[PDB]
């Protein structure tokens, strides 16, 4: 999408994966939606450094809005649980510093049976940018058509255009066409800003392994597509929940660097632990991501239990992840030449290496002809940054 | 298995799980099975506090010996590996104040191939005894027939005791024969004070889920045999290695509790992290597994992706594990009438409730009319202890 936004991945906070649709304020009032929610979490945003990591979006999924629309036919947010309205709460999140994103579904409801944005696209976006959204998360339930469906994300598009006000883009397009039939990237890409590949994460590493694999199985159909102003979207970082175990967080953190993705934390900002936001927080693999030549990773080599990926970066520099997928026994040894390594150019004549995960440290200089040597751990991931250089 | 041992479960460290068979001592000295090894965690066992926990038993598993029997048809361990080999072994071990545990295969070669000991069961178990051995764990690779497998089981039981020394016999018995014929469970429990009845544990929390649910369906045929001298076998704890997070391996901590199982650890206990050693040294829960009563729990409900076990201990209290198999979203609301916990006598007329996992901290008394809510993390349990207020 050539609005001139996302020029690298957007990176920000969504409520979905670990709050969900809980409308139950009277019984569960720390975990239901509501705008005091948002407001705590802007604050936590800002105070414990996630706006300065780059953490910018504060972004609403579903559930946020009234049963039904008002009488001039546009949405509202639900009286009880936003009872401020969403113009207030954008501009509380602006006088922070951050950014405001919402939900809305192209059919006739969001999949949680909300009020869906069939039939109102230009005013639901211009509703949206009166109230100073930020970014849209487009989803696709209800839709009865792949021709509504196009016709619905290419629509909405243009509204939010013809709106005026610079509004990041996120589609559910391609996720909704597998059904029926295969996606056109170059026109996705044209539309949308991001773009949804593959089912919803959950808090499991077997998600994570289901999102990997089935992104290296295709790369060779989505990896070219992604750029500057277009992403493809493995969906929401789930660090700092309950599900994924030290290394499991080590390799989403390292994998979604690699792979150019979106950087959408779904956690609790109030109940993190410190290892958890160091991770979330590291600037040197946030660099990687947020690498302005905007070349999307792709999975190198895979046998053995292991996996080999890289992403070219700018200036000669390449990232490399090295994947363990033996979940029984210890650490295991991995050599690789690294004339092997970014398509032989990443170490010629020679390359500085820094591992960066698990831990930050200087390995030294690599010529074109040497071998390196790591010990990847059970799930887990050892994220090296390739450094080209005509010194030693 | 009437010999005296194993009146509680028994507690130590084994090195499979973590270790495997790694010969590779020229490239992998501080991880292939050795008798440094073994001797470096004998070590930890004592300085770290483990053996003051209750861990006291040392255990080799396969991959110690050497590819042929001597001269004499014993076993012999492998002479570069082991080059003082096992008596000795066993003495620095029992000087520390420790068991040694060992392992041998019924059929005609170990699991990873090496000696199998059919046809030498009476020299084998003298030969253990002679060594100082204190356990033993007979694995059920290469047996060709049932007959077989239920003869050379009972005759190393028969073997072991001829010797006149305590030996703790770990039998992984009724596993092999589960695919061709059910186990008779009070025949098994007269020959082993352990027996392995589900398949092999790894660093995943998909394999504490296989355990749990097959441990669970077949709770009728398994919970009512076990008691002092003859437990159910659920595998390892891998609490501590890479594939767990905390939630999980607090599941895996209380559940091992609840079910009365050994508690053999699988880990390096040169590279563990606080937080793992204090779970699986904490001192209640460990009092819980180790309960002198030595009744097994079961599960006593199970919905909207909820789990409820409970055990009964000494002195009419009661162990009660609430785990959340929903791994998505947040921490997770669940209520139950305290007169539905322990046969409806562990709160009648009241009872004092005392969380203990995922942390410590006294909810207070309950009387028989009372609710207990709690709310539990995804993939998480929360572990109570119910003291009846009459034995107060
Ligand atoms: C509505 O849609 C239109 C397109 O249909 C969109 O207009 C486009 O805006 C982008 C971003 O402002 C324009 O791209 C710029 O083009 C000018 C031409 O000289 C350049 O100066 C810009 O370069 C800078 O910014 C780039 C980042 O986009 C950097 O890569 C670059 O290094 C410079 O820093 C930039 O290329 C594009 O020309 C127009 N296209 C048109 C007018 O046809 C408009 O923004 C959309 N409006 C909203 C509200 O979404
Ligand atoms: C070989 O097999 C035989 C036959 O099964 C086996 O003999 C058994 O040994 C155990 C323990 O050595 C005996 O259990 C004892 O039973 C008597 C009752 O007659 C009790 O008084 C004993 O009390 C112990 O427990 C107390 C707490 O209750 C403790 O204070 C203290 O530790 C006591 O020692 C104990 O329960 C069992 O009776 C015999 N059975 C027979 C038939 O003799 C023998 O141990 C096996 N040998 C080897 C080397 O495995
Ligand atoms: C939302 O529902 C309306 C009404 O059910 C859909 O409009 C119908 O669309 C079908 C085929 O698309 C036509 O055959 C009907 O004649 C339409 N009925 C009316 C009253 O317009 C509409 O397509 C739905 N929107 C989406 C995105 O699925
Ligand atoms: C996929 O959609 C794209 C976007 O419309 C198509 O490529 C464009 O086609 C239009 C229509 O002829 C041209 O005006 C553009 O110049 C094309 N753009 C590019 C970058 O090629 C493309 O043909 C479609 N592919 C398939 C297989 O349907
Ligand atoms: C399961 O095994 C046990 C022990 O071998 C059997 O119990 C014995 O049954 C015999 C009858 O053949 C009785 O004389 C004994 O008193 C029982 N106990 C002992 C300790 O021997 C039991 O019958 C077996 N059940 C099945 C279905 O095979
Ligand atoms: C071991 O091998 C011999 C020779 O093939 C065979 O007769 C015997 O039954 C085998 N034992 C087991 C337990 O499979
Ligand atoms: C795009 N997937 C398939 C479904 C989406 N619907 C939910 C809101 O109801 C979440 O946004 C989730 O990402
Ligand atoms: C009982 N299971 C099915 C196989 C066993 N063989 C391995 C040693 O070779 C481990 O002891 C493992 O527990």
Same mark, same amino acid.
């Given at each position: 999408?050539?609005? &001139? ?90 006088? !922070? ?5 919402? #939900? ?6 969001? /999949? ?30 209800? /839709? ?7 016709? &619905? ?20 397009? +391609? %996720? ?8 056109? #990237? ?47 979207? =493995? ?33 609790? %900002? ?6 958890? !936001? ?13 690498? =302005? %030549?905007?070349?999307?990773? #792709? ?12 992403? +070219? %970066? ?14 029984? &026994? ?47 751990? +059970?799930? &887990? ?12």
């Amino acid at each position: 999408l050539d609005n &001139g936004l996302a020029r690298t991945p957007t990176m920000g906070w969504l409520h979905w994966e670990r709050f969900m649709c809980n409308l139950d304020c009277q019984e569960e009032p720390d975990s239901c939606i509501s705008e005091k929610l948002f407001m705590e979490m802007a604050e936590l945003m800002v105070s414990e450094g996630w706006k300065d990591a780059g953490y910018e979006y504060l972004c609403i999924d579903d559930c946020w809005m009234a049963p039904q629309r008002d009488s001039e036919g546009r949405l509202q947010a639900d009286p009880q649980r936003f009872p401020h309205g969403i113009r207030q709460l954008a501009n509380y999140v602006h006088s !922070k510093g951050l950014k405001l994103g919402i #939900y809305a579904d192209v059919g006739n409801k969001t /999949c949680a049976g909300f009020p869906g944005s069939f039939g109102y696209y230009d005013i639901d976006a211009q509703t949206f940018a009166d109230w100073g959204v930020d970014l849209l998360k487009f989803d696709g339930c209800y /839709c009865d058509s792949l021709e509504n469906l196009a016709d &619905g994300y290419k629509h909405m598009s243009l509204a939010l255009n013809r709106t005026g006000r610079s509004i990041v883009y996120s589609c559910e397009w +391609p %996720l909704y066409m597998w059904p029926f039939q295969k996606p056109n #990237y170059t026109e996705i890409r044209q539309y949308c800003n991001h773009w949804r590949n593959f089912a919803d994460i959950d808090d499991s590493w077997k998600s994570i392994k289901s999102i990997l694999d089935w992104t290296s199985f295709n790369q060779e159909r989505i990896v070219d597509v992604a750029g500057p102003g277009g992403w493809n979207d =493995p969906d929401m970082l789930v660090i700092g929940n309950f599900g994924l175990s030290w290394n499991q967080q080590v390799t989403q953190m390292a994998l979604w660097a690699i792979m150019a993705a979106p950087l959408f934390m779904s956690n609790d %900002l109030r109940h993190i632990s410190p290892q958890a !936001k160091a991770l979330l927080q590291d600037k040197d693999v946030i660099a990687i991501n947020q690498d =302005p %030549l905007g070349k999307q990773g #792709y999975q190198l080599r895979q046998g053995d239990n292991f996996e080999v990926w890289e992403r +070219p %970066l700018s200036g000669l520099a390449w990232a490399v992840a090295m994947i363990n997928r033996q979940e029984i &026994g210890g650490p295991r040894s991995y050599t690789i030449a690294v004339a092997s390594l970014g398509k032989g150019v990443a170490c010629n004549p020679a390359c500085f290496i820094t591992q960066l995960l698990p831990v930050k440290r200087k390995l030294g200089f690599y010529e074109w002809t040497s071998r390196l040597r790591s010990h990847i751990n +059970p799930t &887990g991931t050892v994220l090296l940054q390739l450094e080209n250089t005509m010194q030693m």
